[PDB]
Structure formats: C-alpha cells, structure tokens
C-alpha cells in the first residue's frame, strides 16, 4: 500500500530529470523484472568546489518508506564516509531528514542532496554521528582536513 509514495516519487523523478544541479546523480534502482524501483534510489553527490571535498564523487542510497512523504527518506553513503555527521553504517544525519525535526512532506530530493552536499564541508559538531571523525576534527583540524582530502581523491570519478 505504497501508492501514495509511488505517485509522489514518479513526479520527483520527472522533476529531477527535467532539471537538477550539475554533477549530481539521482536514479531509481531496477527490480529483478526490469521495472523501476522508485523506493530505492542510487545517488551521487559531487564535492563542492573550493573545499577539500572537491574532485570527489560520493555515492549514497536513498530509501523511501511506504508512508512517504509522511516520513523522510533514509540516506546512506556507500561506502560509509569519514565525516562527523555520518554514522559508521553510512547513515547521514540532517535536520530536514528527521520526522520529529525539520522534515516536511514537501521537501524535495534536490533539497536533500544539496543539503547533504552543504553538510560535507560544514559539519554540525554539536551533534556528531561518529566518534572517530568528531574526535579528529576537534583535536587536530589540519589532520582532519588531510584525511578529508585523501578521501576526496580516493573517491574521484
């Protein structure tokens, strides 16, 4: 009973295909029978130019629940990324991605992807999702940036 989610996602797809930010990718996965699976999307976010994330293409999966858009999609970097707000599992944390926070049924995939891109170089240090990245960011910023650059180059297209 995901007909409402599917109706919305079909439109999100047409909208995205019609116009989206350069370098970004957001495409529904395929079911075994070849049909489109609008509930599972494979995306890619380009590092923002001028930042240590530049040159990297970071892939993530967006999973929608049957009650979408009442609930936000779950976004997971694959593989997991070194970042203060990314869980070791890869799950990315963002206010607009939390039902009891800033998520609103209207929020678009484009907004989410741009939001995540912005989060990359502007982490929310007050509420970390992983101990590793947080610790380094706070104890040695130069080392943190060094690890970020290495990761960006590692995930270069």
């Amino acid at each position: 009973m995901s007909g409402i989610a599917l109706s919305r996602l079909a439109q999100e797809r047409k909208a995205w295909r019609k116009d989206h930010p350069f370098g970004f990718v957001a495409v529904p996965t395929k079911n075994p029978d070849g049909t489109m699976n609008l509930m599972n999307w494979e995306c890619a976010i380009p590092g923002k130019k001028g930042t240590p994330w530049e040159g990297g293409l970071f892939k993530l999966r967006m999973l929608f629940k049957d009650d979408y858009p009442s609930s936000p999609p779950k976004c997971k970097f694959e593989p997991p990324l070194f970042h203060p707000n990314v869980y070791p599992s890869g799950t990315v944390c963002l206010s607009i991605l939390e039902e009891d926070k800033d998520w609103r049924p209207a929020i678009t995939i484009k907004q989410i992807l741009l939001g995540i891109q912005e989060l990359l170089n502007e982490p929310n240090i007050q509420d970390p999702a992983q101990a590793e990245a947080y610790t380094i960011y706070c104890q040695n910023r130069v080392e943190y940036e060094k690890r970020v650059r290495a990761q960006a180059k590692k995930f270069a297209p």
Partner: protein, 157 residues
C-alpha cells in the same frame, strides 16, 4: 551466597561483595566477551554499584579489570565498537537504535578512571573517550567530581 546473573539483573554493592573473593573472575567468566554490547552492559552494571568505600571500590575495580582484560585481549574483539556503544549507553553519543541511557554516570566515570590506567587498556581509545567526556552534556555536569578526575587521568595517558 549469590550468583552473577542475579547480580547483573539487580546490581547492588552488597550483591557484588556476596559474590565472594573470586567475584572478579566470576564476572568475566560469566560474560560473553565475544559480544561488545554484552561487555558494555556488564561494564555499566558493575560500575553502577561503585562507592568510594574500601571494599566496594576494590571489588568494582577488580571486576572491571577482569572483564575488560578478557574482552580487550581477544584479537577479534572490536574495541572501537565497545567504545562507541559505551558512549551510546552513557548518553554521550547518539545512535540509530533506541537505548535507555543510565541515569547516574558517577560509577561509570570512576570505573573508567581506573580502567584507563591499566596495561590492558588500548591507548588509541583515550582520545575518543576524552573527546566525549569533555563534550557538553547534562549528565556529565551533574557528576563534576568524577568527570574532572577522569579527564585529569586521560591527560596522563
């Protein structure tokens, strides 16, 4: 007389002392150290009965040492997950799953104070622990003495 299971079910200073002079060995022997989550659980239950009194302090410290030595000395034990889950259960780091953060951090902080001074303790975990004990949190502010002590100790690691 008492048993480990009953103690862990309803921890109390007296129940720990009732385990006998070999209580430290029994705690570690009866804990499945192959599971980080179970080690975190045993560590918190034992530390929850910490009292700044001779017999109790010694019993808790010896138990922590026996338990953590057994866990850490296993080349397969993931010390990072232990630290992460410990922080999660202490309410210092968020998690995707729902957990019930203990109400009093006094014992856990004093137990950690002791643990970090032992040879079996992985020094690489010190920076991570330091980062989350210094990080602002209501639960830590209510245990100022134990908190300052642990931090002062971590500075010497």
């Amino acid at each position: 007389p008492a048993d480990v299971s009953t103690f862990l079910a309803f921890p109390s200073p007296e129940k720990l002392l009732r385990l006998g002079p070999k209580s430290s060995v029994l705690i570690a022997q009866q804990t499945d150290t192959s599971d980080p989550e179970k080690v975190v659980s045993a560590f918190l239950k034992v530390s929850s009965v910490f009292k700044d009194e001779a017999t109790v302090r010694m019993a808790v410290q010896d138990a922590v040492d026996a338990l953590m030595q057994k866990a850490f000395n296993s080349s397969s034990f993931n010390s990072n997950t232990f630290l992460t889950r410990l922080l999660v259960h202490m309410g210092l780091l968020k998690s995707e799953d729902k957990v019930k953060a203990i109400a009093n951090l006094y014992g856990p902080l004093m137990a950690l104070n002791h643990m970090v001074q032992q040879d079996y303790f992985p020094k690489a975990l010190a920076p991570l622990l330091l980062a989350f004990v210094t990080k602002p949190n209501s639960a830590l502010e209510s245990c100022s003495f134990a908190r300052h002590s642990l931090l002062q100790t971590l500075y010497k690691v």
